[PDB]
Design a protein around this ligand. Structure first.
Ligand SMILES: [Zn+2]
Lengths: 278, 95
């Protein structure tokens, strides 16, 4: 009877199974169900996003196997946690992550039973790191135009969710849809160990490995001459006697730094034998 | 400060405001008639010279720049006691 700005404290395994489900999720779009717990009104959590069989027929509401639901929750009951579904996921791995024409039915088909049933759109087949590729929305309906479409209660969460506001047919779909807010949990219980294995492993394992050293320097110094002659083809172009050149057109760099850190590596490699030996 | 997070934070600025006015309270109910001067130009009277009239409790709204150019009166029944430099509610003495 009241509307507040929600929040999704994600288990990272949710997005991990979404990225596996999208990476291995061959760009034919696919459907599944989301499993969390409705904590309160202004927040929700997703603790789990489970897997589906290879339903390569079409995304529809019929694709949910209820015996798979029963056995899935049962195998969670013989495991430690018998949690509750919060909704449904799906995958849009080819195009620009916007609500398909079956989703516009199955969202309210699922939230006729559940409370919120927030959609989750994914596309890890965008590119590799710097996009934030996750997309979630909350179906507002024509029943709720009675009062205004403005929860607003905690603001600047929907204000920074409003800060992109950018997908073509979705900002067309301000109608029927207001998004939900997705932050990523204080995950130090896993971010701790991801950091620790990450840097205890992504440098030489046991880290006694490199401590290749010199014929790579031979090839690198021949690089560092073969490009240095075209490096020095620039101060002749700085002799414009008076002035005949629009702005510096600067090619000083990229051969300071390579020489700098590469021969830092070579001099500390010359250290390395006098280091390992005593 | 951060009133998006909680809309009552925008309400919470109650205790943050003190008056810039001038009050001739010699006796707690008494309303006397004093006329001192504010030596600013009379365009600091802009409320959205020779002298001023800032007395007669309501008190008169004052400017802090007006609070540093003031001068006590000489002809009233009530020529004050302390040299005045603080606003709000202040001193008065009969002479
Ligand atoms: Zn999908």
């Amino acid at each position: 009877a009241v509307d507040t700005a929600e929040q999704v404290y994600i288990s990272s395994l949710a997005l991990l199974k979404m990225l596996k489900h999208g990476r291995a999720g061959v760009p034919m779009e696919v459907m599944g169900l989301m499993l969390g717990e409705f904590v309160d009104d202004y927040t929700v959590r997703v603790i789990d996003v489970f897997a589906m069989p290879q339903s390569g027929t079409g995304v529809s509401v019929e694709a949910v196997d209820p015996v798979f639901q029963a056995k899935m929750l049962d195998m969670l009951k013989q495991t430690g946690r018998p949690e509750m579904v919060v909704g449904w996921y799906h995958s849009h791995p080819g195009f620009g992550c916007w609500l398909s024409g079956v989703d516009i039915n199955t969202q309210q088909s699922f939230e006729a039973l559940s409370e919120r049933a927030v959609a989750v759109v994914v596309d890890p087949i965008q590119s590799v790191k710097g996009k934030v590729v996750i997309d979630a929305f909350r179906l507002i309906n024509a029943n709720m135009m009675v009062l205004g479409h403005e929860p607003r209660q905690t603001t600047s969460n929907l204000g920074h969710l409003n800060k992109p506001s950018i997908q073509a047919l979705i900002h067309g779909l301000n109608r029927h849809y207001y998004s939900i807010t997705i932050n990523y949990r204080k995950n130090e219980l896993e971010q701790k160990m991801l950091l620790n294995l990450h840097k205890k492993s992504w440098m030489e394992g046991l880290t006694l490995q490199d401590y290749v050293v010199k014929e790579m320097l031979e090839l690198a110094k021949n690089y560092n001459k073969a490009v240095e002659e075209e490096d020095k083809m620039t101060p002749e172009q700085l002799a414009i006697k008076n002035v005949g050149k629009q702005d510096p057109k600067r090619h000083l760099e990229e051969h300071v730094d390579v020489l700098m850190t590469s021969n830092i590596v070579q001099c500390l490699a010359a250290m390395l034998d006098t280091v390992v030996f005593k | 400060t951060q009133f998006w997070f909680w809309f009552p934070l925008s309400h919470f600025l109650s205790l943050a405001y003190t008056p810039t006015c001038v009050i001739g309270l010699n006796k707690d109910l008494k309303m006397p008639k004093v006329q001192y001067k504010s030596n600013c130009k009379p365009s600091t009277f802009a409320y959205p010279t020779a002298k001023a009239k800032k007395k007669e409790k309501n008190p008169a709204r004052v400017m802090p720049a007006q609070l540093k150019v003031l001068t006590m009166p000489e002809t009233c029944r009530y020529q004050p006691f302390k040299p005045l430099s603080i606003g709000g509610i202040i001193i008065l003495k009969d002479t």
